[PDB]
Structure 1
């Protein structure tokens, strides 16, 4: 085994990204059972120097296989290529030389967007402008990722993170999901930018149900039949009909008649200008 046998693991130095280990202070886990895997940390100088910011850090669990090493390197490498955008979880640096493998990313203090919304459900805080703002920002992030030839494949609210100032940041771009899959991905395993638009529709619905679970009481086995037979989710009560309209256009059976992310950005931007 690579990890079993090596005293030192000779990953190549990439100076664009290598980050000095003495500038990084590991903190508490950044999940439930995520000790030894994903943690909070403080990182100094990124630079506006001698100054600290909070970041997130992934590492290999003490029982990691060669496969886990590969997955983490792959993910690190994908994040190198994509570039920087305000509405994605950006790579900040890597520690690969002279010690354990660390992948360092932006930390969004408020967690994922499903739980952000669910926690703040009324019996306002989650007003229509707030919801539209979440929708708009996710759309901009996707427009960016699509421009970098990146198909997400698992765009869902659990995979959007919320910063201290309520900025949306898409995560898991560098890697039950069935309910978020376009028919052509379910049936034919084809993923396109337009299958991510479908996924976005579902995410919109998540937003407007304040973190609701899609297709309530429908077993994932029948979802395939139902969607082929033209089943679609209904309008959330927190949703004006004009928005439900967008949602439904995202779930058009024909990929070419779904809007693009550019159009979703522009439509949503107008709804903000209206308020």
Structure 2
């Protein structure tokens, strides 16, 4: 593994802690001097690392993809890498509040999350996806369990390097596109405005394809506005070309965000 002067970070300034999540490995860590302005500062970071792998090429591939995509507010960004003098470390931003799904469920009314905040969550994810799209990257598994929440309530898309979430052309035909991502985004919308609900409640997955093929979709969530449900329904069009682009989704969600923020 070659040295990249643009990303190589010294191991001597990286202290590891308790394992985070599960499996590959993502660990809790302490980084010193991540911000070149203050080298003596300590920040909490996430380190993606490889003890029983053959998978190094997979981690390296992800690393280089992360370098290639670039940075954005709404994605899990690369901070530094440790390729020299030891095992491979991929240091990325942290999300202290876990994924969006669990984040929403914990803040459920029998309402800690105001409605403008919900629309914000959706807007942010839509922004991150638009960026990912423009950087030529299909997910294609976009879900609430893949969107992470930082301490500043910033949405950050992860794993940009499951039947309930898949578009029809992906399920049956194995065709993955930007427009298939938009379908999934429709499901994520439904996930958000149900405050972390499980899609297609009480419906066997084998019955899902029939329902979708029969033109059926999920119902409007109890206290969801028509506009936001209308966006869900547009994402869930059978024809991919009849689905919105992320640009239109960003504008549509910004339109609601700004409006709801009034009262």
So what's the TM-score if we normalise by structure 1? 0.90
- Measure, in 2, the Cα distance between the counterparts of 1:101 and 1:75: 12
Question: Offset at 1:32?
Answer: 5.2
- Measure, in 1, the Cα distance between the counterparts of 2:85 and 2:243: 49
Question: Offset at 1:17?
Answer: 1.4
Q: Secondary structure at the match of 1:38?
A: strand
- Measure, in 1, the Cα distance between the counterparts of 2:207 and 2:3: 49
Instruction: Give the one of 14, 30, 41 matched to 2:29.
Output: 41
> Number of matched residues?
258
Q: Say yes or no: does 1:78 pair with 2:65.
A: yes
- Measure, in 2, the Cα distance between the counterparts of 1:223 and 1:234: 14
Paired residues of 1:128 and 1:238 also in contact (CA < 8 A): no
Question: Offset at 1:40?
Answer: 1.0
Q: Say yes or no: does 1:69 pair with 2:56.
A: yes
Q: Deviations over 1:56-94 (max 9, x none)?
A: 01112x2223xx222212211211110000000001111
Instruction: Give the one of 58, 76, 99 matched to 1:89.
Output: 76
The CA RMSD measured in Å over matched residues stands at 1.4
- Measure, in 1, the Cα distance between the counterparts of 2:49 and 2:159: 16
Instruction: Give the one of 28, 39, 52 matched to 2:42.
Output: 52
- Measure, in 2, the Cα distance between the counterparts of 1:189 and 1:78: 23
Q: Deviations over 1:152-172 (max 9, x none)?
A: 100000000000010000001
- Measure, in 1, the Cα distance between the counterparts of 2:217 and 2:70: 35
- Measure, in 2, the Cα distance between the counterparts of 1:208 and 1:73: 36
The range that moved more, 84-93 or 20-29, is 20-29
The range that moved more, 117-126 or 244-253, is 117-126
Q: Unaligned regions of 5+ residues in structure 2, if any?
A: none
Question: Offset at 1:269?
Answer: 0.8
Q: Deviations over 1:115-159 (max 9, x none)?
A: 000111111312211110100000000011011011110000000
Paired residues of 1:141 and 1:169 also in contact (CA < 8 A): yes
- Measure, in 2, the Cα distance between the counterparts of 1:274 and 1:226: 34
Q: Secondary structure at the match of 2:92?
A: strand
Q: Deviations over 1:28-62 (max 9, x none)?
A: 221157xx8211111111243211111101112x2
- Measure, in 1, the Cα distance between the counterparts of 2:160 and 2:19: 22
Distance 1:173 1:32, change over 3 A: closer
- Measure, in 2, the Cα distance between the counterparts of 1:94 and 1:49: 16
- Measure, in 2, the Cα distance between the counterparts of 1:193 and 1:63: 35
Question: Offset at 1:232?
Answer: 0.5
Q: Unaligned regions of 5+ residues in structure 1, if any?
A: 1-10
Q: Secondary structure at the match of 2:67?
A: helix
2:20 corresponds to which residue?
A: 30
Instruction: Give the one of 181, 190, 194 matched to 2:179.
Output: 194
So what's the TM-score if we normalise by structure 2? 0.94
2:10 corresponds to which residue?
A: 20
Q: Deviations over 1:5-30 (max 9, x none)?
A: xxxxxx22222211111111111221
Q: Deviations over 1:224-272 (max 9, x none)?
A: 2221111200000131111101110110111111111111111111111
Question: Offset at 1:191?
Answer: 0.9
The range that moved more, 189-198 or 221-230, is 221-230
- Measure, in 2, the Cα distance between the counterparts of 1:63 and 1:32: 15
